[PDB]
Every structure is written in C-alpha cells, then in structure tokens.
Amino acid sequence: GAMSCVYAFGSNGQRQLGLGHDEDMDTPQRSVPGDDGAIVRKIACGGNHSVMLTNDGNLVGCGDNRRGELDSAQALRQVHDWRPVEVPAPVVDVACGWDTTVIVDADGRVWQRGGGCYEFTQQHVPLNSNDERIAVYGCFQNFVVVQGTRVYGWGSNTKCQLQEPKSRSLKEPVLVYDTGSVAVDYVAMGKDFMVIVDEGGRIVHASGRLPTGFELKQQQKRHNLVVLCMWTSIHLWNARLNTVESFGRGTHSQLFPQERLDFPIVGVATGSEHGILTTANCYNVYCWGWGEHGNCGPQKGSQPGLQLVGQYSGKPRVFGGCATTWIVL
C-alpha cells in the first residue's frame, strides 16, 4: 500500500486542485485522487487543468475541459473531481501545455489530446532505438520528446525556439538538436524558450527568446548545474554556492533572493511564473515569485523574498504549475 500524500494550493478557478471546490488556496490543501488515494509518479500541470500519473501507468485529472484537456466530451466543460483519464496504453511519462496533454506509453508511442482534439491522437516522432528512454516535456504552446541523445519538438515557433528559420506553427515534430556521444538528461522549457541539459550537468543547447542576462556562451563552461525555467526567466541551482542564479525580466519577484541562505538546498522547482524552494533542517518548503492566487502562500502581494508554506518530516517531491503548487510526500 503506502499511498502518496498530495498537497495542493494556488489557482483553483477550474477546480484544478482536485479539492472539489473552486476557491483559490494560499495554504497546502490535502488532495486525494478518488477513494483511498493513489501512488503518484509525477504531476503534470496545464493552464487550468491538472494531470497526475500513477506508478501503474494510469492517469487521473481535474480542471478545465473546454478544450478537451481531460475527457472526450464537448459537453463536459469542466472535470469536477479527480477522474480517470482514458489511455490507449500504460503511461510511463506525461506532460501538459496550456490546453493540451501529451503522454508516452510503455510501447514508446506518443499521444496528444487537447487544443480541440478530444481523442488521444498519436504523435509520430522520428526514432529507431525504441527501447532506451522516451521522456516528454512541455510548456505553454511547445512540447519536447527526448530519447537518449535525440531531442525532438513541435508547436509554436514564433520566437524561433524550435528551428533555425523563423516560423509560426509546426504540427509534425522535428529534430531541434543532436548529440554527440552524450545522453540528454532533461529539457528545461520556457514559454517561448528552451534549454537542453545533458547528464553531466552542462548546458548543451538553448533556444530563441532567451531572457536578459542569460548568455549562452559563458554558461556552457559551467559544471554540474540544475536548470529550471519559468515563462520569462531561467534559474540555475548552484549547489556549491547554495543559491539560485536567476536571469530574466522579473517584474513580480521572479528573481531568486540574492540574500545568502540559511539552510542547504535539497530541491528547487518552478511553475509558470513562480519558484518553489526546498531546504533541509525536518524539511522546509519556500515559494517566491508571482503569487497572486496564493500559490506562494498567505502573502499574495507578490513581494520579493521567501515565505514558508510548510514543514515536513520527510523530503517532499515538488511540482509547479500555472499559479499552482504541488507537494508530495
């Protein structure tokens, strides 16, 4: 047994917190998927909907359904509580856009629903390894599928983030970057930018519309970095200096407090426009950035600094979303 203990707070206009009600929360609220809960592997957050992947490959979701984010029904404008999302095969990875949801099954296939599509339509990405590791990432209007060394993606190419030539929209996924005798760890994505990070902890490739201050040239010499991106900012977890280097036009305190920290950082996570910090003491969880919907805590004035939102006995897994915050024990 041993189910996951999920806490959720922040934007709740479409009941995307899975609490049943539509009230914006400033304090962590216990979110339980159906009866007797479930074991959570990862939480993918959309614009106004939430998706939760279990260890057995099943999906559960709640939130806006006016664009076909969750259920296959034009009449169903909103999913009230945690309801099972139909999948063609056991899901091993999940991601979400503004009004879309993509998955990766055990067979390796990529399926996408939302944005007008109420059925999981298969996305054809070019590959020939089939049995390495197919991970998927997404943000706003862009998705990225990563397998070993290859990195593919589709969606909006307005700020020239998907391909070298400028464009408008790409439906069929293309190769955005290729290594190189080194596997790609993850891909930190922004609203209109992208950062590719390898397993060595180095920055290998970036995309169009990079935030001010962030220069690709002087950052590719760095070793052992954890890259996290919001919509208009890039954040670097510096374990040696015990801080978070922030770059970008941060009007709503998106910039991590330059003031020296107190406790060692054991986790950093970002949402659409807010950051979530986890330090070790007991484990404390902090939040900074654009927290109007209470996604940063009781203080919804979006003031700079770090405010405590919870203290836990064990190390929590943290997921960020569009003005939402997820804490999993």
Query: To what resolution in angstroms was this structure determined?
Result: 2.4
The C-alpha angle 5, 10, 14, rounded to 5 degrees, equals 95
Number of folded domains that form the chain: 1
Cis preceding-peptide flag for 180 (omega within 30 of 0): yes
Report whether 143 contacts 97 (CB < 8 A). yes
**Any bridge partners for residue 150, and if so which?**
147, 178
Token digits of residue 167: 């464009």
Is beta strand 184-189 parallel, antiparallel or unpaired with respect to 194-198? antiparallel
The one-letter amino acid code at 275 reads: G
Candidates 53, 144, 120; CA nearest to 93 is 53
The domain of 193 spans: 1-329
List C-alpha distances in Å: 130 to 92, 121, 152.
14, 19, 14
Cα–Cα distance for residue pair 296/307, rounded to 1 Å:
7
Report whether 17 contacts 6 (CB < 8 A). no
DSSP H helical segments within the chain, as ranges? 216-219
Token digits of residue 89: 């095969």
Q: What length does the chain have? A: 329
Report whether 127 contacts 101 (CB < 8 A). no
The owner of tokens 């099972």 is 84
Cα–Cα distance for residue pair 194/207, rounded to 1 Å:
5
Instruction: Tell me how far the alpha carbon of residue 170 is from its chain's centroid.
Output: 21
